[PDB]
Paper text:
Neutralizing antibody responses to coronaviruses mainly target the receptor-binding domain (RBD) of the trimeric spike. Coronavirus S proteins contain three copies of an S1 subunit comprising the S1A through S1D domains, which mediates attachment to target cells, and three copies of an S2 subunit, which contains the fusion peptide and functions in membrane fusion.
The heavy chains of both B38 and [name] are derived from the VH3-53 gene segment, whereas the light chain gene segments differ: KV1-9 for B38 (Wu et al., 2020c) and LV2-8 for [name]. Accordingly, the CDRH1 and CDRH2 loops of both neutralizing antibodies share similar conformations and contribute more to the antibody-RBD interface than their CDRH3 loops. Among a large set (n = 534) of cloned anti-[name]-[name]-2 mAbs against the RBD, those derived from the VH3-53 and VH3-66 gene segments were over-represented. Superposition of VH domains from unrelated antibodies with longer CDRH3s suggests that RBD residues 456–457 and/or 484–493 present a steric barrier limiting the CDRH3 loop lengths that are compatible with this binding orientation. We suggest that the key feature of the VH3-53/VH3-66 mAbs identified based on CDRH3 sequence similarity to m396 (Cao et al., 2020) is their CDRH3 length (11 residues), and these mAbs will share the [name]/B38 binding mode, not the m396 binding mode.
Author numbering:
A (entry chain H): 2 to 82, 82A, 82B, 82C, 83 to 100, 100A, 100B, 101 to 126, ...
B (entry chain L): 3 to 9, 11 to 27, 27A, 27B, 27C, 28 to 95, 95A, 95B, ...
Amino acid sequence: VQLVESGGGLIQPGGSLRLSCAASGFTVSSNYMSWVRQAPGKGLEWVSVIYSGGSTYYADSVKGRFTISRDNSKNTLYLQMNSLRAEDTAVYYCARGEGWELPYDYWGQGTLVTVSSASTKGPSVFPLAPGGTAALGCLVKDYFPEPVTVSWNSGALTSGVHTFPAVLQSSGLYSLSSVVTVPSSSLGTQTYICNVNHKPSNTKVDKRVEP
Amino acid sequence: ALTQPPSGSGSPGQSVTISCTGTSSDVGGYKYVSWYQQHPGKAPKLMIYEVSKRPSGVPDRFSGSKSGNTASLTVSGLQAEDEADYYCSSYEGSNNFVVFGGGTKLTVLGQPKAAPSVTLFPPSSEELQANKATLVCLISDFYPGAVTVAWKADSSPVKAGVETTTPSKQSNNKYAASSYLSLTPEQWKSHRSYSCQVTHEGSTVEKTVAP
């Protein structure tokens, strides 16, 4: 059984977003499926359910705004979310079952929905640098929204890489850092490039780090 | 609402019991109590359903019960991997209304103490040319998760312009955190040095950088 979600993103209050949950290993059209959400740093909240015969139910806080449905030929579950509010910001999970007679044994991986009028802002990337060893890094500064991911040398360098959790600044923008320790002899012999991917702004920044 | 204590703790090999209290309308009224285990960054995992039933693959040392309006989850033979947030859920008897408790964070005592590694970076040339300056203090590989970060200009404490993350466990099951100090270019160039000092379990680590 596999459940693979997509569709999350940043949306302004009052806007609309459609989430998808692609399933395999069972038939969505003959099963019970639910949406459950988890607000940042908080607990789980049931959102909606669709029964095997097509009956639907919703939590009171989303009724009239959210609609659950499914596409039998695409074996996919959807959540149409209209008139979004800041209170709807959460990771949304799809799960097979209805939460009581059919408990949530199988879950999707979650998709992040951020409801805010703040602008999307791509990061500014700065180098972190000084025989022996050298700690090299990149400072990924002032971006929004999450997530940013960092690769090194287009993914070919993984050993010794540590990318730290982001900090939320008082400005409301995020920053994070990624670091790798290398032999100082390899500087000027080899090239170290951090690849900073910010899918919310469709941008990747490649910064060569050299003392 | 389902009421769960926010925190629980036990030492390895022992037992712990987590409670979840509600009303005759949910826990006391039906046999539809479920328990979920959630690790940070992961979807919840079903541990118990219909009060006391275990799904396939869930070890026998997890057991569920209820008495009156209170449901209980017992973990015997506690192991480090049981460290997680545990959520109880119940059906409320109407319109598929499934409620979750607030979750109980279970800590397993006895993991070895580990001192933090600290790397401190000065501001980059390109950031200084943008009329900005950030010092970056990266803290990793420590246990337990509580650290105190102090920034110093020369020997004098600096509290303004500091942003520090909440420590979180990395893949090695030890904690990492970072601290960022914002300075003007003039402050950076006009002091002999800046230091990041990290205090942890009565021991101190400090690094120093200079223009």
